[PDB]
Design a binder for these strands. Structure first.
Ligand SMILES: [Mn+2]
Ligand SMILES: [Mn+2]
Ligand SMILES: [Mn+2]
Ligand code: NA
Length: 348
DNA sequence: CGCTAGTCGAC
DNA sequence: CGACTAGCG
């Protein structure tokens, strides 16, 4: 989650409509619709009571995309990436804390505060996601569960040419290298569009419109993989990459004080963490729908060594990866919950 | 000015 | 898993 990236490159945005992508294919970060739909029924989820409103909430958007002649591909989150496990456990503690706090505020009579706390404790399980999967497949909509983050999966789908745009609310997709990203889309088809090619319209960027420099900037600003240094944000990082001509990022980071004229002390931890975050943004494991195989987001460069990228995701057998991608296999228990087969009728 | 961190919407 | 803004370098 690049803190305030949208406001920073606002000059590259454009109010559009989904009708623009008629006859084409788009992929959706379904967690957004799932979350927003889960907000509507927070109490039943917090109490464990049966509910199915978020499903219809997703199906509204889905039926809209279908009505405007668009081909949607719902992408869901899979396994938890080790690089973002600290934040994961943080939210894991916070949601349970807010859960118990909600259960306690339920006894004080303050129902509004209890619901307000039940809203900030929403946990999107893979069972709900699976419900959305089956419900979407009922309408003939192709689904795909990412081996890890849905961000990398959507990124691959957009960069490979399977889809032409990505529907989401997360600006991380821009740092992954998505060509076109649709944001702020309502249930009618009204949203914003941030095109990569139009990043040059942002004067505040300068010569930082290339994918590599944009990535470096996003990481230096502080991502979900590596926390930024105390005092460094988007503008100062952009300034660093603007005033620097050296392609080797390591020396640049080592002289970040020389570029910004600030007494900045850079630990080795932040260097290794930077290389780590970069390798996570570049070579995170995704799943090829057509060839049915676990692949990195981008082709392995000569300067990198795949054996030292466990944090970017661990490899498993492609059959298991297929069973996870289809949603037949549970993400946690690794047990077979469903038995869907695309061979009996995206993948083809 | 730019950035940290707290804060409140979403439905 | 954002947007807005007070407090601060
Ligand atoms: Mn994020
Ligand atoms: Mn995500
Ligand atoms: Mn993300
Ligand atoms: Na920052």
């Amino acid at each position: 989650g690049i803190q305030g990236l949208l406001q920073f490159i606002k000059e590259a945005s454009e109010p559009i409509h989904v009708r623009k992508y008629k006859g084409q294919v788009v992929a959706v970060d379904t967690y957004c619709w799932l979350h927003k739909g889960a907000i509507a029924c927070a109490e039943k989820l917090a109490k464990g009571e049966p509910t199915d409103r978020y499903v219809g909430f997703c199906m509204k958007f889905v039926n809209m995309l279908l009505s405007h002649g668009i081909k949607p591909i719902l992408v869901f989150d899979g396994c938890t990436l080790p690089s973002k496990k600290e934040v994961e456990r943080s939210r894991r503690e916070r949601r349970q804390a807010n859960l118990l706090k909600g259960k306690q505020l339920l006894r004080e009579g303050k129902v509004s505060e209890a619901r307000e706390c039940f809203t900030r404790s929403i946990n999107i399980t893979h069972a709900m996601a699976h419900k959305v999967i089956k419900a979407a497949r009922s309408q003939g909509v192709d689904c795909l569960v990412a081996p890890y983050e849905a961000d990398a999966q959507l990124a691959y789908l957009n960069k490979a040419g399977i889809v032409q745009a990505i529907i989401t609310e997360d600006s991380d997709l821009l740092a992954f290298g998505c060509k076109k990203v649709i944001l702020k889309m309502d249930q009618f088809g009204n949203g914003l569009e941030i095109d990569q090619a139009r990043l040059g319209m942002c004067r505040q960027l300068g010569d930082v419109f290339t994918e590599e420099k944009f990535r470096y900037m996003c990481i230096l600003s502080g991502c979900d993989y590596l926390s930024s240094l105390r005092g460094i944000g988007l503008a100062k990082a952009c300034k660093v990459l603007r005033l620097a001509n050296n392609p080797d990022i390591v020396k640049v980071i080592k002289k970040i004080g020389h570029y910004l004229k600030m007494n900045i002390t850079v630990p080795e931890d932040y260097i290794n963490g930077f290389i780590r975050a970069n390798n996570t943004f570049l070579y995170q494991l995704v799943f090829d729908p057509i060839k049915r195989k676990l692949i990195p987001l981008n082709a392995y460069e000569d300067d990198v060594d795949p054996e030292t990228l466990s944090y970017a995701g661990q490899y498993v057998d492609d059959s298991i990866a297929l069973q996870i991608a289809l949603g037949n296999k549970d993400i946690n228990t690794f047990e077979q919950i469903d038995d869907y087969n695309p061979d009996t009728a995206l993948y083809f």
